[PDB]
């Protein structure tokens with residue numbers, strides 16, 4: 567018995583055709599720079615795996631961002647480096663400019679191009695309907711690119727999308743959780759932030775794929791067009807699935823786990839309940855209606871599906887009528 571296996575419906579075998587060196591990140595050799603080329607200006611944030619600094623390339627007085635990785639996992643460090651180099655130059659992928667050995671932490675410090683990002687809590691309150699569509703398309707370009715290169719981001723969220731709104735410039739960042747997709751490979755479900763975890767992670771289904779990112783993007787889209795950040799506001803990983811079930815309904819959830827022969831954590835027995843699927847119009851009100859269109863709701867409905875295999879791919883999403891009004895490059 568056990569769970570039914572699953573395959574990505576696009577870019578399924580891209581890594582198995584590439585040279586081993588492309589995805590065998592453990593055997594990667596880092597090309598080092600000079601750490602005294604950079605002067606740290608101010609710490610921008612600290613996470614479980616890194617500290618991020620605004621810095622200045624003191625050789626050309628250029629602003630950069632330095633991400634000093636914590637020595638928690640070495641395999642994870644080579645993984646993020648290899649993925650950043652594999653994806654370098656792709657549309658709206660953050661550009662890894664240099665790698666140095668930080669003298670204090672004695673760990674790799676990644677040097678990125680600088681983005682004049684505005685905080686997403688402040689920025690999302692200002693976005694028009696057109697802005698949301700425009701930036702959603704820009705995010706899709708990055709996602710389709712990394713998916714086409716055999717890589718899933720696995721941490722899509724507003725905090726990991728840097729936007730220079732004055733210049734309409736967008737970069738997908740924090741590739742510290744990204745992984746190469748290998749068909750049939752079972753992955754760690756402790757990825758992404760709670761509010762953006764796909765149902766596959768919440769039901770402990772490990773054989774997921776690029777479509778995880780498309781659920782996370784749908785969560786971002788819902789928060790933007792309905793102006794509720796986050797949209798699924800679970801208090802823990804279990805309540806997170808309950809929050810989703812109160813919107814998408816429990817019948818489709820059971821159909822999803824039945825299709826893949828998944829058994830829910832019995833902890834859900836007394837908290838999941840029975841919920842009908844809600845029409846998206848329940849979340850429309852006077853304060854967000856100018857951001858809601860039939861095209862937006864159809865697009866959101868095709869992202870926020872329990873069955874990861876049924877979600878729009880990034881490429882399919884860019885074909886959606888929701889983006890007909892956006893002027894393309």
Ligand SMILES: COc1ccc(N/C=C2\C(=O)CCc3c2oc2cc(Cl)c(O)c(Cl)c32)cc1
Nearest residue numbers: 610618631660678679680681682683739740741
């Ligand atoms: C508070 O005022 C400001 C102004 C600018 C910023 N800019 C942050 C970033 C960038 O400009 C480069 C990409 C990057 C940034 O933060 C990151 C974090 C991680 Cl974890 C990561 O992997 C990457 Cl690539 C980045 C942040 C705050």
